[PDB]
Enzyme design. Sequence first.
Site, short mmCIF file in Angstrom:
data_model
loop_
_atom_site.label_atom_id
_atom_site.label_comp_id
_atom_site.label_asym_id
_atom_site.label_seq_id
_atom_site.Cartn_x
_atom_site.Cartn_y
_atom_site.Cartn_z
N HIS A 1 3.91 10.88 6.59
CA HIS A 1 3.47 10.34 8.05
C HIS A 1 4.74 10.01 8.65
CE1 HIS A 1 -0.77 10.24 6.32
NE2 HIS A 1 -0.36 11.57 6.46
N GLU B 1 -3.22 13.51 1.67
CA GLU B 1 -4.28 13.23 2.34
C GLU B 1 -5.04 14.31 3.04
OE1 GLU B 1 -3.46 9.66 4.84
OE2 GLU B 1 -4.24 8.59 2.95
N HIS C 1 0.83 -1.24 -0.04
CA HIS C 1 0.13 0.15 0.12
C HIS C 1 0.84 1.27 -0.12
CE1 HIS C 1 -0.18 -1.33 4.55
NE2 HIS C 1 -0.22 -0.01 4.82
N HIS D 1 6.25 6.81 6.39
CA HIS D 1 5.84 6.44 5.11
C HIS D 1 5.08 7.83 4.21
CE1 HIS D 1 2.03 6.03 7.32
NE2 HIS D 1 1.57 6.48 6.46
N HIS E 1 2.38 9.33 1.28
CA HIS E 1 1.11 8.97 0.29
C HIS E 1 1.30 10.01 -0.85
CE1 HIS E 1 -0.93 6.95 3.42
NE2 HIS E 1 -0.32 7.75 4.52
N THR F 1 -5.12 6.51 8.60
CA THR F 1 -5.85 6.61 7.30
C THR F 1 -6.02 5.57 6.24
OG1 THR F 1 -3.90 7.82 6.27
CG2 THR F 1 -5.40 9.15 7.49
#
EC number: 4.2.1.1
Length: 258
Positions: free
Chosen positions: A117, A104, A62, A92, A94, A196
């Site tokens: 994050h 996000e 992911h 990590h 996104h 999230t």
Amino acid sequence: HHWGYGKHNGPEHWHKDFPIAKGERQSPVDIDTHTAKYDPSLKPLSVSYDQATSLRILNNGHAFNVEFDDSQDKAVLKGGPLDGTYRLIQFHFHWGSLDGQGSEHTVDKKKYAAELHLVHWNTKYGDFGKAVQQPDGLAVLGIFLKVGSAKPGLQKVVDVLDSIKTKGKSADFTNFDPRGLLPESLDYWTYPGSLTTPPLLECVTWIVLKEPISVSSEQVLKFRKLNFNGEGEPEELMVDNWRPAQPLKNRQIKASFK
Ligand SMILES: [Cl-]
Ligand SMILES: [Zn+2]
């Protein structure tokens, strides 16, 4: 058919396996800068990453996680809205298929190209797995990325992504210093919220920094070359692994600055 970011398994399907997706304190959210309350009782964050030990980088299908040794108080976050000491366990990102989406959290509806994050758990609870069960168990520091200039301290991250291309791969990743990812200022908004990704537990104090860092177009391009799949199933590019903004409901966002 387990969760992901596609048409058939994407965030709008999550609630069917993880009903708390429709909960009262879901993240991320839009940060409305004019409705956020300056709260002069908030202290400065204290970030002590001098003794941080990175161990490993992995593609978990992911995102990619850089993992730290959290067996002692080596890289810790205190202060701010927090009571107690929170230990770094992972960070990590996104990111988007294009430069105008990927984050996000949003700031007056503006999307950034990616969001970092840094995940911390509250030492009072003894391990991460017990922490996620507590309303005050986690603190994630969120940092926005815009595309402009290169960030030199992210470079070691980008150079190994070739070696963890597909789901399940991992590589040794020692002596990385997370200070090279911090912006100049530590002003922030904070609000109570959730992971999230699934399991979307409502265990997080969010600390979202005002100041973005810059990365280069070439740098974010390499994030986009990773795969959601394992070696070699059919190739799906790891892109748009962000959950959209969720209802603020009965929550106040507080700012450390005016
Ligand atoms: Cl995870
Ligand atoms: Zn995240």
